[PDB]
Design an enzyme around this catalytic site. Structure first.
Site, PDB file in Angstrom:
ATOM      1  N   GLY A  27      10.200   8.843  -1.840  1.00  0.00           N
ATOM      2  CA  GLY A  27      10.264   8.373  -0.468  1.00  0.00           C
ATOM      3  C   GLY A  27      11.302   9.057   0.398  1.00  0.00           C
ATOM      4  O   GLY A  27      11.448   8.717   1.573  1.00  0.00           O
ATOM      5  N   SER A  28      12.017  10.022  -0.174  1.00  0.00           N
ATOM      6  CA  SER A  28      13.052  10.749   0.556  1.00  0.00           C
ATOM      7  C   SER A  28      13.938   9.795   1.356  1.00  0.00           C
ATOM      8  O   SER A  28      14.408  10.131   2.445  1.00  0.00           O
ATOM      9  CB  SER A  28      12.418  11.778   1.497  1.00  0.00           C
ATOM     10  OG  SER A  28      11.763  12.800   0.765  1.00  0.00           O
ATOM     11  N   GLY A  29      14.153   8.601   0.812  1.00  0.00           N
ATOM     12  CA  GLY A  29      14.983   7.616   1.480  1.00  0.00           C
ATOM     13  C   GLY A  29      14.218   6.662   2.381  1.00  0.00           C
ATOM     14  O   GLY A  29      14.805   5.729   2.928  1.00  0.00           O
ATOM     15  N   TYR A  31      11.971   4.523   1.481  1.00  0.00           N
ATOM     16  CA  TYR A  31      11.781   3.235   0.814  1.00  0.00           C
ATOM     17  C   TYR A  31      13.150   2.621   0.536  1.00  0.00           C
ATOM     18  O   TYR A  31      13.269   1.431   0.244  1.00  0.00           O
ATOM     19  CB  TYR A  31      11.059   3.424  -0.522  1.00  0.00           C
ATOM     20  CG  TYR A  31       9.860   4.344  -0.491  1.00  0.00           C
ATOM     21  CD1 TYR A  31       9.536   5.115  -1.599  1.00  0.00           C
ATOM     22  CD2 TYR A  31       9.042   4.430   0.627  1.00  0.00           C
ATOM     23  CE1 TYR A  31       8.438   5.948  -1.598  1.00  0.00           C
ATOM     24  CE2 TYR A  31       7.936   5.259   0.639  1.00  0.00           C
ATOM     25  CZ  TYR A  31       7.638   6.021  -0.480  1.00  0.00           C
ATOM     26  OH  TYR A  31       6.542   6.860  -0.487  1.00  0.00           O
ATOM     27  N   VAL A  34      15.070   3.995  -3.995  1.00  0.00           N
ATOM     28  CA  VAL A  34      13.938   3.776  -4.886  1.00  0.00           C
ATOM     29  C   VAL A  34      13.644   4.959  -5.792  1.00  0.00           C
ATOM     30  O   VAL A  34      13.752   6.115  -5.391  1.00  0.00           O
ATOM     31  CB  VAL A  34      12.657   3.437  -4.071  1.00  0.00           C
ATOM     32  CG1 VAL A  34      11.471   3.208  -4.998  1.00  0.00           C
ATOM     33  CG2 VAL A  34      12.905   2.196  -3.219  1.00  0.00           C
ATOM     34  N   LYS A  49      13.701  -0.287  -7.499  1.00  0.00           N
ATOM     35  CA  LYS A  49      14.552  -0.301  -6.323  1.00  0.00           C
ATOM     36  C   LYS A  49      15.914  -0.891  -6.634  1.00  0.00           C
ATOM     37  O   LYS A  49      16.021  -1.998  -7.160  1.00  0.00           O
ATOM     38  CB  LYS A  49      13.872  -1.109  -5.227  1.00  0.00           C
ATOM     39  CG  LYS A  49      14.619  -1.220  -3.931  1.00  0.00           C
ATOM     40  CD  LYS A  49      13.813  -2.107  -2.992  1.00  0.00           C
ATOM     41  CE  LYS A  49      14.497  -2.281  -1.671  1.00  0.00           C
ATOM     42  NZ  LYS A  49      13.707  -3.203  -0.823  1.00  0.00           N
ATOM     43  N   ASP A 164       7.230  -3.666   2.237  1.00  0.00           N
ATOM     44  CA  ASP A 164       8.279  -3.555   3.239  1.00  0.00           C
ATOM     45  C   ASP A 164       9.450  -2.749   2.692  1.00  0.00           C
ATOM     46  O   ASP A 164       9.887  -2.957   1.565  1.00  0.00           O
ATOM     47  CB  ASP A 164       8.794  -4.927   3.683  1.00  0.00           C
ATOM     48  CG  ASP A 164       9.689  -4.832   4.913  1.00  0.00           C
ATOM     49  OD1 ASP A 164      10.056  -3.698   5.278  1.00  0.00           O
ATOM     50  OD2 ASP A 164      10.032  -5.875   5.516  1.00  0.00           O
TER      51      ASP A 164
HETATM   52  C1  LIG Z   1      12.380  -5.130   1.866  1.00  0.00           C
HETATM   53  O1  LIG Z   1      12.239  -6.448   1.328  1.00  0.00           O
HETATM   54  C2  LIG Z   1      10.951  -6.971   1.500  1.00  0.00           C
HETATM   55  C3  LIG Z   1       9.887  -6.681   0.595  1.00  0.00           C
HETATM   56  N1  LIG Z   1      10.101  -5.862  -0.506  1.00  0.00           N
HETATM   57  C4  LIG Z   1       9.224  -4.856  -0.880  1.00  0.00           C
HETATM   58  O2  LIG Z   1       8.187  -4.635  -0.242  1.00  0.00           O
HETATM   59  C5  LIG Z   1       9.600  -4.092  -2.084  1.00  0.00           C
HETATM   60  C6  LIG Z   1      10.406  -4.638  -3.125  1.00  0.00           C
HETATM   61  C7  LIG Z   1      10.714  -3.839  -4.249  1.00  0.00           C
HETATM   62  C8  LIG Z   1      10.229  -2.503  -4.357  1.00  0.00           C
HETATM   63  C9  LIG Z   1      10.595  -1.715  -5.589  1.00  0.00           C
HETATM   64  C10 LIG Z   1       9.422  -1.951  -3.318  1.00  0.00           C
HETATM   65  N2  LIG Z   1       8.893  -0.647  -3.314  1.00  0.00           N
HETATM   66  C11 LIG Z   1       7.722  -0.189  -3.854  1.00  0.00           C
HETATM   67  C12 LIG Z   1       7.708   1.149  -3.570  1.00  0.00           C
HETATM   68  C13 LIG Z   1       6.673   2.115  -3.917  1.00  0.00           C
HETATM   69  O3  LIG Z   1       5.753   1.931  -4.704  1.00  0.00           O
HETATM   70  N3  LIG Z   1       6.839   3.267  -3.229  1.00  0.00           N
HETATM   71  C14 LIG Z   1       5.954   4.429  -3.330  1.00  0.00           C
HETATM   72  C15 LIG Z   1       4.931   4.407  -2.203  1.00  0.00           C
HETATM   73  C16 LIG Z   1       5.000   3.432  -1.159  1.00  0.00           C
HETATM   74  C17 LIG Z   1       4.064   3.428  -0.095  1.00  0.00           C
HETATM   75  C18 LIG Z   1       3.050   4.409  -0.055  1.00  0.00           C
HETATM   76  C19 LIG Z   1       2.977   5.394  -1.076  1.00  0.00           C
HETATM   77  C20 LIG Z   1       3.919   5.392  -2.140  1.00  0.00           C
HETATM   78  N4  LIG Z   1       8.842   1.421  -2.890  1.00  0.00           N
HETATM   79  N5  LIG Z   1       9.642   0.336  -2.689  1.00  0.00           N
HETATM   80  C21 LIG Z   1       9.129  -2.766  -2.205  1.00  0.00           C
HETATM   81  C22 LIG Z   1       8.600  -7.249   0.827  1.00  0.00           C
HETATM   82  C23 LIG Z   1       8.322  -8.098   1.945  1.00  0.00           C
HETATM   83  C24 LIG Z   1       6.884  -8.666   2.126  1.00  0.00           C
HETATM   84  C25 LIG Z   1       5.875  -7.496   2.281  1.00  0.00           C
HETATM   85  C26 LIG Z   1       6.498  -9.530   0.897  1.00  0.00           C
HETATM   86  C27 LIG Z   1       6.724  -9.563   3.388  1.00  0.00           C
HETATM   87  C28 LIG Z   1       9.417  -8.373   2.844  1.00  0.00           C
HETATM   88  C29 LIG Z   1      10.706  -7.822   2.631  1.00  0.00           C
HETATM   89  N6  LIG Z   1      11.706  -8.115   3.523  1.00  0.00           N
HETATM   90  S1  LIG Z   1      12.978  -9.088   3.133  1.00  0.00           S
HETATM   91  C30 LIG Z   1      12.623 -10.083   1.709  1.00  0.00           C
HETATM   92  O4  LIG Z   1      13.180  -9.949   4.249  1.00  0.00           O
HETATM   93  O5  LIG Z   1      14.049  -8.165   2.837  1.00  0.00           O
END
Ligand SMILES: COc1c(NC(=O)c2ccc(C)c(-n3cc(C(=O)NCc4ccccc4)nn3)c2)cc(C(C)(C)C)cc1NS(C)(=O)=O
Length: 336
Positions: A27-29, A31, A34, A49, A164
């Site tokens: 994600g080059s940062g 994400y 990660v 993450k 997200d």
């Molecule tokens: C930021 O916190 C989140 C999150 N966390 C995540 O979505 C999350 C958690 C952990 C991981 C390891 C990941 N994650 C997965 C990937 C991945 O597969 N990347 C490759 C890739 C990616 C894309 C295209 C191609 C390739 N990268 N990061 C995501 C979710 C949510 C919702 C969606 C449920 C409403 C709200 C908040 N907001 S809050 C609680 O208020 O803080």
């Protein structure tokens, strides 16, 4: 307690269970901190993450807890789920880092559309899933607030997941948020879906603004100046005048923008891209819309279990948030 091993990726020290092998930054940062890795227990690739500075401040501490709690609750086909969560700490005393593990997504919505124009069938399926996942998140009294192509992942069979990372977000942001109307409801997410769906049908960003003001003027030019009905719901007088002064550009008709598109798709678009959020269609209603007839199923569009968000109205000390987070880490039970 698993056996951990540490290494330095980029400039950060990762300490993870041996179970996870071949860590690789991604994600080059985009994400955040990660890494992609190989889950040896299942042979499936995952995303690991490492929360930045989880407990450096009260704000960080609460966001850490918020994300851990939310991920633990999200159990839906169209929403990212938590596969594992761990820490190298052996006690609360040394507890300083939190790692969240999820399946590794393949490609976002941009990567898929950047190719050739998707068919109408393709668009139905994608938007349908976003809407299906949205029904679920919204049923848990949760608002995404930052829906966009880069936050939407799609696999081989075009299955979609909402994620997200905490395309500019603004282009898909509802106008009321950019006007700081404070009283945003869930449909702020429906506005985003409309902008996304529009882009998938035209290949172009619907409201490509340079700054919020320009973006705002673009929106008003298309959805029109606020009607009497909407105006009477705006308490602030300066707010009322401002929103009108931003709708001075020469109007544009909706139909023209989506010419050639399936008439059903434009109908839904007109029900999603409504200035007055009160009159904006909800995820649940959108799912029943005739545009999704070949996909809609009232029996396979589940909602979320009651979600306890009492912590959001709490003001606690860092150590309190940290203890709460630690508890959630230890009580985590992986899904089958
Ligand atoms: C930021 O916190 C989140 C999150 N966390 C995540 O979505 C999350 C958690 C952990 C991981 C390891 C990941 N994650 C997965 C990937 C991945 O597969 N990347 C490759 C890739 C990616 C894309 C295209 C191609 C390739 N990268 N990061 C995501 C979710 C949510 C919702 C969606 C449920 C409403 C709200 C908040 N907001 S809050 C609680 O208020 O803080």
């Amino acid at each position: 307690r698993p056996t951990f091993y540490r290494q330095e990726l980029a400039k950060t020290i990762w300490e993870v269970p041996e179970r996870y092998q071949n860590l690789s930054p991604v994600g080059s940062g985009a994400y955040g901190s990660v890494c992609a890795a190989f889950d040896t227990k299942t042979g499936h690739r995952v995303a690991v993450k490492k929360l930045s500075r989880p407990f450096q401040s009260i704000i960080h501490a609460k966001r850490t807890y918020r994300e851990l709690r939310l991920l633990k609750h999200m159990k839906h086909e169209n929403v990212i789920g938590l596969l594992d969560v761990f820490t190298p700490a052996r006690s609360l005393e040394e507890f300083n880092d939190v790692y969240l593990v999820t399946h590794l997504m393949g490609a976002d919505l941009n990567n898929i559309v950047k190719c050739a124009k998707l068919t109408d069938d393709h668009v139905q399926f994608l938007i349908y899933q976003i809407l299906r996942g949205l029904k679920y998140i919204h049923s848990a009294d949760i608002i995404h607030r930052d829906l966009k192509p880069s936050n939407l992942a799609v696999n081989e069979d075009c299955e979609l997941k909402i994620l997200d990372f905490g395309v500019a977000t603004r282009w898909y942001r509802a106008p009321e948020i950019m006007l700081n109307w404070m009283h945003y409801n869930q449909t702020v997410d429906i506005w985003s879906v409309g902008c996304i769906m529009a882009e998938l049908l035209t290949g172009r960003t619907l409201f490509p603004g340079t700054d919020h003001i320009d973006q705002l003027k673009l929106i008003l030019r298309l959805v029109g100046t606020p009607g009497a009905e909407l105006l009477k719901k705006i308490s602030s007088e300066s707010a009322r005048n401002y929103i009108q002064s931003l709708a001075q550009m020469p109007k544009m008709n909706f139909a023209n923008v989506f010419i050639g598109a399936n008439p059903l798709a434009v109908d839904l678009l007109e029900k999603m891209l409504v200035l007055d959020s009160d009159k904006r269609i909800t995820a649940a209603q959108a799912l029943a819309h005739a545009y999704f007839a070949q996909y809609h199923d009232p029996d396979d569009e589940p909602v979320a279990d009651p979600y306890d968000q009492s912590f959001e109205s709490r003001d606690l000390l860092i150590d309190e948030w940290k203890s709460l987070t630690y508890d959630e880490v230890i009580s985590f039970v992986p899904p089958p």
